Structure 1
Amino acid sequence: TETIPDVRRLRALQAEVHEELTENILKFWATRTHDPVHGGFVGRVGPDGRPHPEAPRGAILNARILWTFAAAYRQLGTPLYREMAERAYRYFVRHFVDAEHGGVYWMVAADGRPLDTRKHVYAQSFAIYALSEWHRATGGEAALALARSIYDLIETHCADRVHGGYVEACDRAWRPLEDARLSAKDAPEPRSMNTHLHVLEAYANLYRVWPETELAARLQALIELFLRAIYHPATGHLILFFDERWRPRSRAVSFGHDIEASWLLLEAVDVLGQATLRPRVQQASLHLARATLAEGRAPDGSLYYEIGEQGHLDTDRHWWPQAEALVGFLNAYQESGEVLFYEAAEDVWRYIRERQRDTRGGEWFARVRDDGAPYPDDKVDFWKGPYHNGRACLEAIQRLRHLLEHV
């Protein structure tokens, strides 16, 4: 009694997503971004497509490049992707990894010299996430050892054992800072959904390749924290910022993070095999997906950016909430069987193809205005890597493969 799209449609979508990933996204990253002056990858590519090999380079961007090529190599086998992942890995261990105090720096100069040596938990998480994926792709022992060491540092210097969760930023020598903001957009509060979501994401990937008992408990504690403090059942949205005891300190809504969390929380519980926790997580996950469906979308099916603290709807289409909606809506279809979620996934994909991707200049536009005009934003920068859109394509391809197997 499944309602399932016909084989033609599933295959057509899968083919389009694969083409987008391999002929647009990964092609751009493999050809435009490698830097033969300093090694590794450039920190910025402007709106005109020009790479800037002298720009400062962020740990998050570089971890994202490692993760994406590693995951693409694992799933698709293409030797170029392993080559590109190795390139990212080598630069990362050489320059981002602090061999003295452990963990990864926030930002280095193009030549590898540390510029911003803070140890932000968000960056530590992305390091764990990428290193564990590289291990999953290659069996590399050093990558897994490094991921384990960073996990140990987060738990040692950042874990709040009284209230749950984590202090989010420390200095180079792991002493806590007051200002844990990832960027100027962010509220100056001690706890954020965003950082905790990516600790969860990282820990789930680590557990998959290293199923340590204590890690399972830390991951479960994070899932339980989301269910108890972060997810808001009255509205179907995540609360974004908090004090140390998880009292809400924000009323803003992020549609992209809602739909991202919707599928990542289920990935995390499934990695654990925690059958007792799953029903509650699925309920919250489906709610986040429905809330996004009903409140976060334009008539074209694309996702708006946020409702701000004063209530203003930011109608810009940023690239990453569209990617996250592709996976989150397909996931919601898989979980619920409700084909309206598949239709929503199809609609966001059509938007991605018709509006978000940049056919002229390659990759995807960072932002498109409500009237359809692309903003002249950078194509690659500190916060724009190949991870959200690359992962979204990889996830969709695999999910559509499973759906095709129901026949």
Structure 2
Amino acid sequence: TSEKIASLRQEIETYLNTGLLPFWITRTVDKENGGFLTHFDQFGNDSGEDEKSLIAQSRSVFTYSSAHRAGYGGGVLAEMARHGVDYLINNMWDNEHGGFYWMTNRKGEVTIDQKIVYGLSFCIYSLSEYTLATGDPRGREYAEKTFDLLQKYAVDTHYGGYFEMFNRDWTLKGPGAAGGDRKTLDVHMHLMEAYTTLYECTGQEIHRRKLLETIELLVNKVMHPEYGTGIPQFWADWSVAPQIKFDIVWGWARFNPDGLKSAAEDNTSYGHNSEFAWLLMHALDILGLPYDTYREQITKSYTHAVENGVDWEFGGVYVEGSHAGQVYDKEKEFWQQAEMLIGMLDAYRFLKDEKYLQAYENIHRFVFDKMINHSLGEWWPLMTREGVPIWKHMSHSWKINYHDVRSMIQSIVRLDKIAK
């Protein structure tokens, strides 16, 4: 219903303009040391972490670049992005070996000099988006510099794909938790997301060809060969590896005590599969290719998410479950809802089955009625199945505004497409 679509779009528009973006605009710009402040407790007050992670600073650069480019933030977001791009190049860029450092403290000193491809993907993503929004060639320059370093040091020229964790001097890290012997869905999915904006910015044949190569890797090696769902970790030879926690992390380790099959290695994340599918669709948009170029893959990702991840009774998407169709972890974490909002919409656009629009409204209602802490404007990071926050910290080094702002803008955009 156009009245229902308009109601949903307005709910997002008011919340995005008066709640979410103001939460960050009034808090994050650090004029003393440069960069952004991203550590806020359940009362919007500083938690005091002496960290400015590459993930935090780059995602902020992306959010403010993309939101300004979309027409949000009252025009002040572009200069906020430049403030962060200033911090990235001046404090986080390695002037002897290249690439962006993983971690800095509050005053700008490098504290983890490793070159993590997961963070470097977000550098390529955010700096490409930054140049697209502001025209500053510094974004594209350092994004191209990062891409070239990934080709030189990270690309496995035999098996394909990328090695994902390196020391500061770009030497491959050790095996196991050091991160030097695994190829992961986490990194390879976001490089596809990164190369999409990179190619959109530069327009080179090389960036279009490597974006397609990244899509091919995900479809042919990363996703389940039968179910099409994302498998988290692989060996270099692309056989499935046992899932491990790397020494370098970019999230809080959450164990659901009442989760099912704790040791099961066949888990897949509905939020990841939805995030991959709509990002692949957006990649096809940027590539000028039709969606059904990967109709089998896109249909597998969305069908699996809507049939197993959507909590129809309480609302929101579950954390993870088996490829076969069993739900393992029924908790409610913030980023999977964000990615499910966009995906379920794009699923409705491509597959045209109304259970996807129902799936969107289920998750839309969950985020606005349960997840959004309206007194501050940010999202609760983790919740019991029926709502009710488990963790109440509003933001940290790994939870900023990348997922929620983009999912808000992209949802108004796709909902507008559906109404027409």
* TM over 0.5, shorter chain: yes
2:283 equivalent to 1:279: no
Equivalent position to 1:367, from 378, 382, 392 = 382
- In structure 2, distance between residues paired with 1:70 and 1:142: 13
Q: Deviations over 1:103-138 (max 9, x none)?
A: 111000111110000001111110010011111111
2:100 equivalent to 1:85: no
Secondary structure of the residue that 1:375 maps to in structure 2?
strand
Secondary structure of the residue that 1:269 maps to in structure 2?
helix
- In structure 2, distance between residues paired with 1:27 and 1:259: 28
Alpha-carbon offset, residue 308 of structure 1: 7.8
- In structure 1, distance between residues paired with 2:24 and 2:7: 25
- Kept after mapping to 2: 8 A contact 1:191/1:243: yes
| Residue identity opposite 2:298 in structure 1 | S
- Kept after mapping to 1: 8 A contact 2:309/2:318: yes
- Kept after mapping to 2: 8 A contact 1:326/1:392: yes
**Aligned position for 2:191:** 199
- Kept after mapping to 2: 8 A contact 1:227/1:284: yes
- In structure 1, distance between residues paired with 2:315 and 2:212: 34
| Residue identity opposite 1:343 in structure 2 | Q
**Aligned position for 2:182:** 190
Secondary structure of the residue that 2:111 maps to in structure 1?
strand
- In structure 2, distance between residues paired with 1:342 and 1:378: 31
- Kept after mapping to 1: 8 A contact 2:104/2:111: yes
Alpha-carbon offset, residue 193 of structure 1: 0.4
Equivalent position to 1:134, from 108, 130, 134 = 130
- In structure 2, distance between residues paired with 1:164 and 1:140: 33
Equivalent position to 1:288, from 301, 315, 323 = 301
| Residue identity opposite 1:300 in structure 2 | F
> Which shifted more, 77-86 or 7-16?
77-86
- In structure 2, distance between residues paired with 1:308 and 1:104: 36
**Aligned position for 1:266:** 281
| Residue identity opposite 1:383 in structure 2 | W
- In structure 2, distance between residues paired with 1:360 and 1:188: 43
**Aligned position for 1:392:** 407
Equivalent position to 1:95, from 91, 99, 108 = 91
Alignment of 1:210-289 (within 5 A): 210-249=202-241, 250-274=265-289, 278-289=291-302
Secondary structure of the residue that 1:164 maps to in structure 2?
coil
Alpha-carbon offset, residue 53 of structure 1: 5.4
Alignment of 1:310-389 (within 5 A): 313-389=328-404
**Aligned position for 2:245:** none
> Which shifted more, 99-108 or 88-97?
88-97
Alpha-carbon offset, residue 234 of structure 1: 2.5
Equivalent position to 1:161, from 148, 151, 157 = 157
Task: Name the Cα RMSD after superposition.
Answer: 2.1
Secondary structure of the residue that 1:32 maps to in structure 2?
coil
Alignment of 1:106-145 (within 5 A): 106-145=102-141
Q: How many residues were matched structurally?
A: 393
**Aligned position for 1:302:** 316
Secondary structure of the residue that 1:237 maps to in structure 2?
coil
Alpha-carbon offset, residue 283 of structure 1: 2.2
2:51 equivalent to 1:56: yes
Secondary structure of the residue that 1:176 maps to in structure 2?
coil
- Kept after mapping to 2: 8 A contact 1:308/1:314: no
Secondary structure of the residue that 2:5 maps to in structure 1?
helix
- In structure 2, distance between residues paired with 1:308 and 1:42: 37
- Kept after mapping to 2: 8 A contact 1:43/1:53: no
Alpha-carbon offset, residue 32 of structure 1: 2.4
Secondary structure of the residue that 1:191 maps to in structure 2?
strand
- The runs of 4+ residues in structure 1 deviating greater than 4 Å are 179-182
Alpha-carbon offset, residue 384 of structure 1: 0.3
Secondary structure of the residue that 1:232 maps to in structure 2?
coil
Equivalent position to 2:15, from 14, 17, 20 = 20
- Kept after mapping to 2: 8 A contact 1:230/1:239: yes
Alpha-carbon offset, residue 201 of structure 1: 0.5
**Aligned position for 1:3:** none
| Residue identity opposite 1:23 in structure 2 | T
The gaps in structure 2 that reach 5 residues or longer are 242-264
- In structure 2, distance between residues paired with 1:360 and 1:43: 18
Alpha-carbon offset, residue 284 of structure 1: 0.9
**Aligned position for 2:35:** 40
Secondary structure of the residue that 2:76 maps to in structure 1?
helix
Alpha-carbon offset, residue 329 of structure 1: 0.3
- Kept after mapping to 2: 8 A contact 1:64/1:130: yes
- In structure 2, distance between residues paired with 1:88 and 1:282: 38
CA distance 1:166–1:188, shift in 2 (3 Å): closer
Q: Deviations over 1:18-46 (max 9, x none)?
A: 12222221111111223343222124212
Q: Deviations over 1:296-328 (max 9, x none)?
A: 12233311112389x882222000100000000
| Residue identity opposite 1:336 in structure 2 | L
- In structure 1, distance between residues paired with 2:366 and 2:316: 6
- Kept after mapping to 1: 8 A contact 2:163/2:180: no
- In structure 2, distance between residues paired with 1:38 and 1:173: 26
- In structure 1, distance between residues paired with 2:234 and 2:286: 27
- Kept after mapping to 1: 8 A contact 2:102/2:113: yes
What TM-score do you get using the length of structure 1 for normalisation?
0.91
